[PDB]
Amino acid sequence: FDRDRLFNVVARGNPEDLAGLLEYLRRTSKYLTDSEYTEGSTGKTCLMKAVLNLQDGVN
């Protein structure tokens, strides 16, 4: 599980595709605010791109 897959998941908007993320984070013992999940060069997180991409009024 990687950063690009997570950004594609939050950009698409399927809640079923975000499966086993908590189990993966508990297995590797790292959080969503870690440097591998954020961009780091600009600090962009998955919540920021998740709010940027709104096909409807909600995501």
Contact criterion met (CB below 8 Å) for 46 and 10: yes
Closest CA to 45 of 1, 14, 16, 3: 3
How many Å separate Cα 29 from the centre of its chain?
16
* Structure determined via: cryo-EM
Place of tokens 């950004």: 7
Q: Where are the beta strands (DSSP E) in 1-59?
A: none
- Deposited resolution, Å: 3.3
Residues 6+ apart with CB under 8 A from 21: 1, 6
| CA distance to 4, 15, 33, 46, per residue, from 39 (Å) | 10, 22, 10, 9
